Design a protein around this ligand. Structure first.
Ligand SMILES: *[C@@H]1O[C@H](CO)[C@@H](O[C@@H]2O[C@H](CO)[C@@H](O)[C@H](O)[C@H]2NC(C)=O)[C@H](O)[C@H]1NC(C)=O
Ligand SMILES: *[C@@H]1O[C@H](CO)[C@@H](O[C@@H]2O[C@H](CO)[C@@H](O)[C@H](O)[C@H]2NC(C)=O)[C@H](O)[C@H]1NC(C)=O
Ligand SMILES: *[C@@H]1O[C@H](CO)[C@@H](O[C@@H]2O[C@H](CO)[C@@H](O)[C@H](O)[C@H]2NC(C)=O)[C@H](O)[C@H]1NC(C)=O
Ligand SMILES: *[C@@H]1O[C@H](CO)[C@@H](O[C@@H]2O[C@H](CO)[C@@H](O)[C@H](O)[C@H]2NC(C)=O)[C@H](O)[C@H]1NC(C)=O
Ligand SMILES: *[C@@H]1O[C@H](CO)[C@@H](O)[C@H](O)[C@H]1NC(C)=O
Ligand SMILES: *[C@@H]1O[C@H](CO)[C@@H](O)[C@H](O)[C@H]1NC(C)=O
Ligand SMILES: *[C@@H]1O[C@H](CO)[C@@H](O)[C@H](O)[C@H]1NC(C)=O
Ligand SMILES: *[C@@H]1O[C@H](CO)[C@@H](O)[C@H](O)[C@H]1NC(C)=O
Ligand SMILES: *[C@@H]1O[C@H](CO)[C@@H](O)[C@H](O)[C@H]1NC(C)=O
Lengths: 183, 243, 200, 50
């Protein structure tokens, strides 16, 4: 999109910002590019009362975005939602007259990758003196192998528990007619 | 129709609007593929799962180039350049560093495995409760009134398609808690009393279907001097006119 | 230290992940609805008194008395605010642990959501559940008188509506007394809010 | 080593807090936005509202 950036000095008063610094680069402050938030000092962004949904979190209720206004970077206060007010009375009610069928999707992870590690090849490789020296350091690698094997078995256990509810393999009828429903 | 009865709507509502419901379901199913394809970051969780393992393995491989305070990171150079009784103190540092790296990797893997196991248990519960039956828990198998669900498989994960019922096109009405008649109070069996401005009917909860007030769908069980906000009207006895 | 690998990158990554997960948890818990409902100006609900849980407009932060007691009961050490280096260099001859932590590279970041936004979310949820019942949780909010909603709930638990409609005043008085006793019960117990204090 | 120990403890505590937050979110969804029939999930007795 663009090469423009903004800087945030964390937990620093805007009056105490340094202008000999450890970083060689420095950003020069103009009249309207300096803002003070409860998270620190922001340089390179402009503040407005226009409120939108949060795009890039910054601090306590302050977000930043890239807006065309000439494109630039702006900072604002995040909006909770649309304003509403339902009328209440003790002798009135509201009743729906129509309906809508909706379909929604949900994604859930199940398992991950199963990995194995060889101690001798990773630590010492082909060296024999290194292996002899490592032989007197205990049995950590046995514990490592046991933990990895346990994780590997648990992955397959999770998959089996999730995807093996029924023990019968049903088949759909050859004729696909279900009262007008298209599957 | 059984499912609509389960959510609290009579079967005649379904049987009189079969084509519209089928068309709405078909359109909702058709929109799903376009919605999934248009969104670039829809399947972010599985990609994160893959990327975490890839990054962990890459970091473990990259860690082999560290010196850990020794003179070199290659064992052959140390062996060929140093006294055999002296080269041991250089190999010890490398061994300790690589052991620490392995310990860190194993601990991170164990924590991630615990998180994945929790997620898999939640997914199995959702499979058991939303697909094999109808759930009455709020916001457990989608937003709205749950009807049914469909499972699909994905790399290292599952995808649930929930079908829900949403009311729409509401209207205002005047209501009363009970109806007074012949010095007796009447309450609806199922539904609510409704007034269109002149007359009074009784309807069900989630669909507007006015009916004539009758002793068949009301019960008295009380008097007419204690209910606050009662309104008096006429209750119709079905058998009396036909004798 | 430059030749000891990249452990610190992993440390930073883990800390950043935890920091993001905290805000994610807060957002998942407290952002169920996307509409900001408002309570009607007239506070009459068939004899039910909700003054102890509704926001108080007199105070600046607009918090209910119960929320006031809850916030006063829990003592917080650092809220992630600007612990300015000027405060540490003030040299009031009373060196606290916060300045010692700050001088050694340990810092605390503020949360994304402020207390006012969480209070607004709670107030919106309360208004929605009072003026509509459970309809706003599955679609558009539908108005309904409160006694009728409570009669619906009694029918849900397995009791006929005439039981409610003939004992409205007694039920309202019992609810009012039970709500009133809650503040006294919370204030009297010294170790009521132990979990949050343990977390701190 | 001190930093590693601190980070591991923080990760474990974060996992526990995440589990607690998930439980709290489920309770918010089920007890406040509706009426629950699960025994001893939204209080002791017959649940009315929250
Ligand atoms: C309930 O909503 C459906 C869906 O919007 C309405 O069906 C539409 O009716 C209009 C007017 O006849 C048609 O132009 C549309 O093509 C219909 N849509 C579909 C998907 O069939 C239905 O009319 C509404 N019910 C009432 C009583 O107004
Ligand atoms: C169920 O929906 C599918 C998808 O729209 C229908 O398949 C389409 O059928 C038309 C008519 O033969 C073709 O022109 C399209 O190319 C098909 N689409 C695809 C993606 O193959 C299918 O016909 C519908 N079922 C019924 C019984 O009408
Ligand atoms: C409320 O409902 C009643 C009953 O349906 C309506 O009365 C009917 O009005 C139509 C139109 O004038 C007449 O043709 C019917 O004969 C009336 N029915 C009876 C039983 O008298 C009444 O109009 C409705 N109120 C409003 C404001 O529309
Ligand atoms: C709802 O309960 C509150 C709390 O008891 C009532 O507020 C009290 O009102 C009386 C009479 O004006 C005062 O003497 C008390 O000092 C009030 N208490 C507090 C804590 O402010 C309130 O009046 C009740 N609502 C109604 C409609 O009666
Ligand atoms: C920044 O310094 C000025 C100096 O007078 C002070 O008034 C102000 O309160 C300080 N702001 C913060 C957030 O510390
Ligand atoms: C932003 O809103 C505040 C609050 O009313 C107002 O005082 C200020 O002038 C506004 N700033 C601009 C640039 O419009
Ligand atoms: C509620 O009922 C009372 C009757 O005592 C009435 O005065 C009041 O206007 C009603 N509420 C509304 C919003 O009309
Ligand atoms: C019901 O009446 C209220 C107040 O007059 C109004 O705000 C609302 O829009 C009405 N409902 C419908 C469906 O028109
Ligand atoms: C019917 O209701 C009206 C309106 O409140 C009332 O004036 C009248 O007395 C009632 N009829 C009887 C028989 O009580």
């Amino acid at each position: 999109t663009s090469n423009q950036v903004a800087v945030l000095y964390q937990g620093v008063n805007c009056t105490e910002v340094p202008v000999q610094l450890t970083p060689t680069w420095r950003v020069y402050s103009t009249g309207s590019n300096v803002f003070q938030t409860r998270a620190g000092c922001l340089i390179g962004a402009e503040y407005v009362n226009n409120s939108y949904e949060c795009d890039i979190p910054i601090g306590a209720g302050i977000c930043a975005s890239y807006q065309t206004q000439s494109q630039s970077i702006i900072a604002y206060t995040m909006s909770l939602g649309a304003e509403n007010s339902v009328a209440y009375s003790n002798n009135s009610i509201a009743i729906p007259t129509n309906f809508t069928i909706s379909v929604t999707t949900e994604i859930l992870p199940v398992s991950m990758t199963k990995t194995s590690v060889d101690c001798t090849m990773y630590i010492c490789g082909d060296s024999t003196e290194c292996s002899n020296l490592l032989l007197q350091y205990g049995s950590f690698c046995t514990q490592l192998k046991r933990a990895l094997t346990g994780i590997a078995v648990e992955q397959d256990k999770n998959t089996q528990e999730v995807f093996a509810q029924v023990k019968q393999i049903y088949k759909t009828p050859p004729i696909k007619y279900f009262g007008g429903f298209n599957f | 129709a059984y499912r609509f009865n389960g959510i609290g709507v009579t079967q005649n509502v379904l049987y009189e609007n079969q084509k519209l419901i089928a068309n709405q379901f078909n359109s909702a199913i058709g929109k799903i593929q376009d919605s999934l394809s248009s969104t670039p970051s829809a399947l972010g969780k599985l990609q994160d799962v893959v990327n975490h393992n890839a990054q962990a393995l890459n970091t473990l491989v990259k860690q082999l180039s560290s010196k850990f305070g020794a003179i070199s990171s290659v064992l052959n150079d140390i062996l060929s350049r140093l006294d055999p009784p002296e080269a041991e103190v250089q190999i010890d540092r490398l061994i300790t560093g690589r052991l620490q790296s392995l310990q860190t990797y194993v601990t991170q893997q164990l924590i991630r495995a615990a998180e994945i196991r929790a997620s898999a248990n939640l997914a199995a519960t959702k499979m058991s409760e939303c697909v094999l039956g109808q759930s009455k828990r709020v916001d457990f198998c989608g937003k709205g009134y749950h009807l049914m669900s469909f499972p699909q498989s994905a790399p290292h994960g599952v995808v649930f398609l929930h079908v829900t019922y949403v009311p729409a096109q509401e209207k205002n009405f005047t209501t009363a808690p009970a109806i007074c008649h012949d010095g007796k109070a009447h309450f609806p069996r199922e539904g609510v009393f409704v007034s269109n401005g002149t007359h009074w009917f009784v309807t069900q909860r989630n669909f507007y279907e006015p009916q004539i007030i009758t002793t068949d769908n009301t019960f008295v069980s009380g008097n007419c001097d204690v209910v606050i906000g009662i309104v008096n009207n006429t209750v119709y006895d079905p058998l009396q006119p036909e004798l | 230290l430059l030749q000891y690998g990249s452990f610190c990158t992993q440390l930073k990554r883990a800390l950043t992940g935890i920091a993001v997960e905290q805000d994610k948890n807060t957002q998942e818990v407290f952002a169920q609805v996307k509409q900001i409902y408002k309570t009607p100006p007239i506070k009459y609900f068939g004899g039910f008194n909700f003054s102890q849980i509704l926001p108080d407009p007199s105070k600046p932060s607009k918090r209910s008395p119960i929320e006031d007691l809850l916030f006063n009961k829990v003592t917080l050490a650092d809220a992630g605010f600007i612990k300015q280096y000027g405060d540490c260099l003030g040299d009031i001859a009373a060196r606290d642990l916060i300045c010692a932590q700050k001088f050694n590279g340990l810092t605390v970041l503020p949360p994304l959501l402020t207390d006012e936004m969480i209070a607004q979310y709670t107030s919106a949820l309360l208004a929605g559940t009072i003026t509509s019942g459970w309809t706003f949780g599955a679609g558009p909010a539908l108005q309904i008188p409160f006694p009728m909603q409570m009669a619906y709930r009694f029918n849900g638990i397995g009791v006929t509506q005439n039981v409610l409609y003939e004992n409205q005043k007694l039920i309202a008085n019992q609810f009012n007394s039970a709500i009133g006793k809650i503040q006294d019960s919370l204030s009297s117990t010294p170790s009521a809010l132990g979990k949050l204090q343990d977390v701190v």
